[PDB]
Every structure is written in structure tokens, then in C-alpha cells.
Amino acid sequence: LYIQNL
Amino acid sequence: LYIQNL
Amino acid sequence: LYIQNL
Amino acid sequence: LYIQNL
Amino acid sequence: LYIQNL
Amino acid sequence: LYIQNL
Amino acid sequence: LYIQNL
Amino acid sequence: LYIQNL
Amino acid sequence: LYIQNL
Amino acid sequence: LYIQNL
């Protein structure tokens, strides 16, 4: 599970 | 589980 | 579990 | 468990 | 458990 | 499992 | 498991 | 497990 | 396990 | 386990 907010 | 907010 | 806020 | 706030 | 606030 | 990004 | 980023 | 970043 | 970063 | 960073 990989979550990135950029 | 990887969470990054940038 | 890895959490980074930048 | 790794938490970093920068 | 590693917590860093910078 | 609940995930929300806003 | 609950994850929210805002 | 509850995670919130705001 | 509860984690909140604000 | 409770963790809060503010």
C-alpha cells in the first residue's frame, strides 16, 4: 500500500 | 504501508 | 509502516 | 514504524 | 518505533 | 480499509 | 485500517 | 489502525 | 494503534 | 499505542 500526495 | 505527503 | 509529512 | 514530520 | 519532528 | 486523500 | 490525508 | 495526517 | 500528525 | 504529533 503506497500513497503519495504531491 | 508507505504514506508521503509533500 | 512509514509516514512522512513534508 | 517510522514517522517524520518536516 | 522512530518519531522525528523537524 | 478506508483511504481518503483531500 | 483507516487512512486520511488532508 | 488509524492514521490521519492534516 | 492510533497515529495523528497535525 | 497512541501517537500524536502537533
Author numbering:
A (entry chain A), B (entry chain A), C (entry chain A), D (entry chain A), E (entry chain A), F (entry chain B), ...: 1 to 6
The authors write:
Aggregation-prone-motifs (APRs) of proteins are short segments, which – as isolated peptides - form diverse amyloid-like crystals. Crystallographic and spectroscopic analysis revealed that a single amino-acid substitution can greatly reduce topological variability: while LYIQWL can form both parallel and anti-parallel β-sheets, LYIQNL selects only the former.
In the monoclinic crystals grown from the ethanol containing solvent system, strands arranged in the class 3 topology could be observed, while the orthorhombic crystals grown in the absence of ethanol contained strands arranged according to the class 4 topology. While the class 4 structure did not contain any solvent molecules, the class 3 structure contained both water molecules and two ethanol molecules, one in a solvent channel near the chain termini and another wedged into the steric zipper interface. The assembly is stabilized by a hydrophobic cluster formed with Leu and Ile side chains complemented by “pure” Asn-Asn and Gln-Gln H-bond pairs. Tyr side chains also interact within the steric zipper interface in the class 3 crystal structure, here again with a displaced face-to-face geometry. However, it should be noted that in this crystal, the ‘odd interface’ (formed by Leu1, Ile3 and Asn5) is a dry one, that doesn’t contain a solvent molecule, and therefore this molecular architecture may be stable even without the ethanol molecule present.
